[PDB]
């Protein structure tokens, strides 16, 4: 029989609100969208503002103010709650703050009876995916993090503007930690079928500009925060696409926070890191295994070791 | 010869940014979006955040930070700049400040050689539309204000929730000044082909409940501002829809800020007010005229007299 | 847990194939589409042609050759099987022949354990909807026919071309039999908020031009059959919208083949006929009832009495 | 100022009508669609059938029956007119017949004053693209053929079913003549960024399976023709995607009938053949030049030799 697909959103700030907006505009069958925030006034205001535009939507959608009661029968739970760049300094203190919040949130969600899929966006996304997995006891393939999807989006925009080519034809990935230790898969990048190495040999692009594009990908968050306070639109679209791919059972490969256990180096094991995986109706279907050049394998290993280091502390 | 369609957005606040985001998601052929703001940092940050999500869009779109000089060959100019009102404030009050702002903006735009269509969202929207028309000396059919489209969307959502029927089947308008003096076309309202009067007879809705819905429509702005600082999602969708109807040459009737000079009894003439008009590629094709209940006509004339009072102060 | 929505198409002719194509293009999430035809080569070929274009679709979709075995776990069964009307042949001339086909189809379907929703398009659509309900022994809310949705689309196109106004703003229905006994709700018709009587008064349209539009609606099928043998595009879109409205649980009012037993004066009861009804996740939520002019009521009763003259012979 | 975009379709058969249907459903702002056919009755019937479903479309669009005089101000001309291969008809016979038909069509069109873009689909599509360019005298960049876009779509569907992965991650081309002398770019294929080589090593696929996939791609046309008479859905979607890429100025790379004179070793020059090119508002912006394995270059040169000989005959 036909069912009502339910998505609960925990965290009604810039990122969560942007995701909800984009989802109401472009919906792949999300019958009910439930919004939860510790600041209940903000959640109620967002629910009202999103409902007031139903007349302009292609489809109608039930946007509801919610409590954790609502997670019992939910099909997806999207977490965007946290302290976006808090004041005390230190990203280890950030991890502590946000994992403290996640303890509470996850306990409430699991005590509700929820048995769907987690989609995690709160920073540091990889560590918070790990924390969600452990605090919840869910299977690893029911816990997803956005990982390097936003970094990959930025990378592909930079390459599209460089070559003046639709992002549709830009086949490159950012992998590793969603942060400063990320790396681009330069050696495996293609523009449509044309390898990047041919573009280098023909002089359209140089290794210098590749270094600069990567530095740009890494500095984009800081640039945008300086310019406008926060970043939410691109990540909102990424979250929306993950959700639509899940509910669409599209078997699509995405650069998400993936749990690796031998893939790539046979060295990196037992953590969530930015990597390509198949997404479908049940969550993660497969963590893809492919060879990366030695340079990029060393970068991957260093990134995973940085992640292990930050986990160890707490 | 195929053309590149250009929209210049002036005012990169909540409303303008929401409209730009929605437009990038649901794009009816806008090839170039130029974002202007007296706060250059905010415009640049919004441009970067909007471009970093191209990968997730149906179609790539060129988004630019620009300056008034870009209005020269622009096809549409959307103005969302000004003061946005806060607790204990109204819309009919930010009139002299916002009119000065519009003087400056319009002078710059027209000086650049622009000759396209103005789409005005800033408040008080009817008054600012009249101001745009007279400062620009453009044809009146090239000046569109958003009018009562947001009020109408809210009304239709409330009626949809009451009857649990898709908004598509809700045929009702809010008319008059976008604000406190507005009214609903209760006596002309239908659910599909079923008159609202029949629902009243059947006891499925009450007169008191209609008055409740109208008070909710009028107080929605104050509610949502109290709850989350400002409204911007619904109005962003409405602006997106107006822009797409223009570029698409869709000949669609919308309740916008329309110039009346004889319609609805001709008691009040030569002002912009919330009323239905046909929108097309060239701007406003017609401002329609239909008979409304006598009580509703009295309400309409009261609203128009308030507006004309504020305008005659000049 | 999330679900795979399944639609089984029975009848891979022009109408069925148009519906399948349109659905693959504009897919409110059918994860699986099965195509059944007594001419199995035709079904195989259609399946292949539909799958060969997956690269150009927004979303992938599994299109399968199947048999009645596939109806067991089907969420929706669309029936487009039957006999086309030949030149000089009315829809009702098919009653006998097609009735026999349905007896077989409905038999097999019911034997597989299907307990979803029927969407009936084969002609004469109202009588075939009644026959489906009687053979299947299903609840009346689980059997839907397209009724006068196609005639209504035609009426709205003709009015949109007369007034040069988007079909969005054309609020008029064709009701009664999907055939030569249909009528238009001229007295209840409105263009946005503006009644049709006001256009008549202003001379923007004449009574005789309304009669001409009705005659054109009635004779559209015969004209198109003469010109190219059969119609399938418009009805393809109509069925597609019905299906997406069901799966989307959109609670949308549509002029479908609705079961009446007391509505519209109760002078004829216990038939299916073209009338407005709410569509949602599990079929028909409610068959509406509104008051229509006495002449229109005489026409409605004539049509209903014709349809019952046929149903009584059964 | 804003322009109306005009597409003129010559040939209202299966392919042209499917393209028109798909375009009305998924419309990147074609304001006017004009359908021309020597068989006036068929064109009129299709115009009526497409118009009768406007109420179900996301956007309204003026679909009109017309004559060659309408090409004067057309922005795109899509030619689907001509015969398809029959049993015992070689590419040579089809070339003869369809080149005569194109003589007629191109003469009429150019006499009308048309100065837009040609999109060619009649078979053999590479030769007919060359012939359109030669007869019209238009620039090379203003004459586009569908090339191997359909064979590429079929290839990617087959790989998507085999690897059970979204077509959106299947990076592989069919190149050469749109026919039996086509070949797959096996040695440059990647799923996401896992080379097909790696899939072969692990036994996930075999060489015989690749040969059978290429055989299926080459035989699909005959199979579907035997099964249901003709193919037209997939190529309809392909033509629609090309038209929307054009009007959208999307700068997208597609495997179309591209004019080569140096690329791929430059052994054969001055022909249209299935190859990747950037599509934009002005037509073909650039014909790309990635380089391929020795096997595949031998195949490509054989195919180009075929085409060039058939051309030199004339
Ligand atoms: N139905 C409607 O039409 C509605 C109208 N609204 C009004 O829209 C306007 C914008 O609202 P918000 O975005 O929420 O407020 P906001 O402060 O977040 O944004 C206003 C923007 O305008 C900028 N600005 C000011 N002057 C100029 C100038 N001369 N040139 C360029 N930019 C300038 C300013 O820097 C700011 O970024 C306000 O007047 C609102 O009252 C808001 C809600 C709905
Ligand atoms: N509701 C509406 O508005 C309209 C109703 N239409 C009717 O829809 C029906 C189909 O029309 P067309 O597609 O043009 O005709 P068609 O000949 O092209 O296709 C009908 C299909 O039904 C097949 N069929 C017959 N019996 C069975 C069976 N037991 N199981 C499976 N398949 C079977 C048959 O092989 C054929 O392929 C006709 O009855 C039309 O009169 C057509 C147009 C619009
Ligand atoms: N994964 C990515 O690519 C990426 C992109 C941008 C930033 N982020 C991060 O994700 C989060 C997004 O934050 P933001 O930009 O929306 O800032 P924000 O402050 O506007 O939103 C954070 C929300 O979390 C709420 N919250 C706090 N504790 C809560 C609790 N126990 N339960 C429910 N809600 C609670 C807060 O009330 C607030 O509304 C941050 O951690 C941010 O650093 C993710
Ligand atoms: N990937 C591809 O390129 C591909 C795929 C399928 C078939 N085709 C080809 O497209 C063309 C149409 O295929 P079809 O299946 O629709 O066959 P069809 O017979 O159904 O349609 C051809 C149309 O062209 C019309 N026509 C003939 N001569 C004309 C003239 N001088 N002026 C105007 N119109 C004329 C005919 O009236 C007919 O309607 C064929 O050449 C076919 O081989 C393209
Ligand atoms: Ca550039
Ligand atoms: Ca309710
Ligand atoms: Ca007209
Ligand atoms: Ca006339
Ligand atoms: Ca498979």
Residue B189 CA, ligand 7 centroid: distance in Å: 27
Q: How far apart are CA D141 and CA D282, in angstroms?
A: 8
Instruction: Name the residue among C30, C122, C109, C29 with its Cα closest to residue C71.
Output: C109
Shared domain for C115 and C167, answered yes or no, is no
Q: Which residues partner with A306 through β-bridges?
A: none
Name the interface residues of B facing C (CB cutoff 8 Å): 58, 164-166, 168-169, 171, 173, 185, 188, 190-195, 198, 250-253, 276, 278, 288-291
Structure tokens that stand for C109 in this block? 């379907």
Q: Give ligand 2 pocket residues (Cβ under 6 A).
A: C 10-15, 36-39, 42, 80-85, 101, 104-105, 121-123, 125, 146, 150, 178, 230-232, 235
Ligand 3 close to Cβ of residue A182 (< 6 A):
no
A45 contacts in chain B (CB < 8 Å): 223-224, 226-229
Whether B102 and B135 have beta carbons less than 8 Å apart is answered as yes
Contact criterion met (CB below 8 Å) for A173 and A255 = yes
Binding site for NAD(+), residues of A?
Answer: 15, 37, 42, 68, 82-83, 121-123, 146
Looking at the fold, whether C87 and C175 belong to one and the same domain comes out as no
Interface touch A234/B153, C-beta < 8 Å: no
Q: Does C134 lie in the same domain as C186?
A: no
Task: Kindly state whether residue A1 falls inside one of the protein's structural domains.
Answer: no
The technique by which this structure was obtained is: X-ray
Q: Residue holding tokens 């099909």?
A: A75
Whole-angstrom Cα Rg for chain A: 19
Last residue in a domain, options A145, A163, A180: A145
Residue ending a domain, choose from B145, B167, B197: B145
C156 annotated as a binding-site residue:
yes
Of the residues D145, D173, D206, the one at which a domain ends: D145
B173 and B110 both lie in a single domain: no
Contact: B164, C251; criterion CB under 8 Å: yes
On whether the CB atoms of residues A287 and A263 are closer than 8 A, the answer is yes
Q: After which residues is chain A broken (C to N over 2.5 A)?
A: none
Q: A124 and A249: one domain?
A: no
Decide if A80 is inside a domain: yes
Residues 6+ apart with CB under 8 A from C145: C119, C120, C121, C125, C126, C128, C129, C132, C256, C257, C272
C145 is annotated as contributing to ligand binding = no
Query: How many whole angstroms separate alpha carbon C242 and alpha carbon C79?
Result: 13
CATH number at residue B78: 3.40.50.720
Instruction: Tell me how far CA of residue C209 lies from CA of C155, C174, C181, C183, C292, in angstroms.
Output: 12, 16, 19, 15, 21
Torsion sign over Cα B305, B310, B311, B312: positive
Tracing tokens 């699986």 back to the chain, one arrives at: C32
In a domain, C222, yes or no: yes
Are residues B171 and C168, on separate chains, in Cβ contact within 8 Å?
no
User: Could you tell me the distance, in angstroms and rounded to a whole number, from the CA of residue D130 to the centre of ligand 4?
Assistant: 17
| Residue B1 in domain | no
> Has residue A22 been placed in a domain?
yes
Quote the CA–CA distance of D63 and D50 in Å, as a whole number.
Answer: 7
Give me the CATH number covering residue D223: 3.90.110.10
Residue of D nearest to A191 (CA): D253
Q: Measure the CA–CA gap between D160 and C60, rounded to whole angstroms.
A: 10
A136, A170: one domain: no
> What is the tally of structural domains in chain B?
2
**Alpha carbon distance C24, C43 (integer Å):** 16
Query: Does the residue C1 lie in any domain?
Result: no
What would you measure as the largest C-alpha separation in chain B, in angstroms? 60
**H runs (alpha helix) in chain C:** 14-25, 40-51, 95-111, 125-136, 149-163, 196-201, 207-228, 233-247, 294-313
D159 and D252 belong to one structural domain: yes
Instruction: Supply the residue whose CA is at minimum distance from atom 8 of ligand 4.
Output: D122
Resolution rounded to one decimal, in angstroms: 2.1
Q: Report the C-alpha gap between C79 and C75 in whole angstroms.
A: 13
Instruction: Tell if the CB–CB gap between A171 and D191 is shorter than 8 Å.
Output: no
- Asked if A28 and A116 sit in the same domain, the reply is yes
**Tokens 């068959």, residue?**
C287
**Within this chain, do residues A223 and A304 fall inside the same structural domain, yes or no?**
yes
- Find, among A77, A130, A76, the residue nearest to A99 by Cα: A130
Looking at the domain assignment, is residue D1 inside a domain? no
Residues less than 5 Å from ion ligand 6, measured at CB? B 161, 164
Q: Residue C231, Cα to own-chain centre: how many angstroms?
A: 13
Give residues with Cβ within 8 angstroms of D34, minimum separation 6: D6, D7, D8, D9, D64, D65, D66, D70, D74
Residue C75 belongs to a domain: yes
**Residue B90 near residue A195, CB atoms below 8 Å:** no
Rounded (10°) CA dihedral A140, A141, A147, A153: 170
Contacts of D248 in chain B (CB under 8 A): 29, 31, 59
Q: Give D-chain residues touching B75 at CB under 8 angstroms.
A: 1-2
Provide the residue range defining the domain that includes D107.
Answer: 6-145
- Identify the three-state secondary structure at position D252: strand
Examine the domain organization and report whether D129 and D183 are in the same domain: no
Contacts of residue B82, defined as CB under 8 A and 6 or more positions apart, other chains included, come to B11, B94, B97, B98, B101, B102, B122, B123, B128
Pair B170, B131 in one domain: no
One domain for residues C275 and C133: no
3-class DSSP state for residue B42?
A: helix
């Amino acid at each position: 029989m036909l069912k009502s697909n339910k998505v609960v959103l925990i965290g009604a700030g810039g990122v969560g609100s942007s995701f909800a907006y984009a989802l109401t505009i472009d919906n792949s069958l999300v019958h009910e969208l439930v919004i939860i925030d510790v600041n209940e006034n903000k959640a109620k205001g967002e629910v009202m503002d999103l409902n007031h535009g139903q007349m302009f939507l292609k489809k109608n959608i039930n946007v509801l103010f919610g409590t954790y009661k609502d997670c019992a029968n939910a099909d997806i739970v999207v977490i965007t709650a946290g302290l976006n760049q808090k004041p005390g300094e230190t990203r280890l203190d950030l991890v502590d703050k946000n994992s403290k919040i996640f303890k509470d949130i996850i306990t409430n969600v699991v005590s509700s009876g929820f048995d769907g899929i987690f989609v995690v966006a709160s920073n540091p996304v990889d560590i918070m995916t790990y924390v969600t997995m452990k605090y919840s006891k869910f299977p690893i393939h029911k816990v997803i993090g956005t990982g390097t999807i936003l970094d990959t989006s930025r990378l592909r925009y930079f390459l599209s503007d460089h070559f003046n080519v639709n992002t549709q034809n830009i086949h490159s990935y950012i992998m590793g930690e969603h942060g400063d230790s990320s790396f681009a898969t330069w050696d495996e990048t293609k523009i449509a079928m044309k390898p990047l190495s041919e573009y280098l040999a023909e002089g359209k692009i140089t290794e210098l500009e590749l270094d600069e594009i990567h530095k740009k990908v890494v500095n984009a968050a800081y640039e945008v925060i300086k310019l406008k306070g926060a970043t939410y639109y691109a990540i909102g679209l990424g979250i929306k696409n993950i959700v639509n791919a899940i509910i669409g059972d599209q078997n699509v490969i995405l650069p998400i926070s993936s749990y690796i256990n031998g893939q790539y180096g046979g060295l990196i094991k037992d953590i969530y890191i930015g990597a390509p995986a198949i997404v479908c109706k049940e969550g993660v279907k497969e963590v893809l295994n492919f060879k990366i050049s030695p340079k990029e394998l060393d970068k991957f290993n260093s990134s995973a070791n940085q992640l292990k280091s930050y986990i160890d502390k707490m």
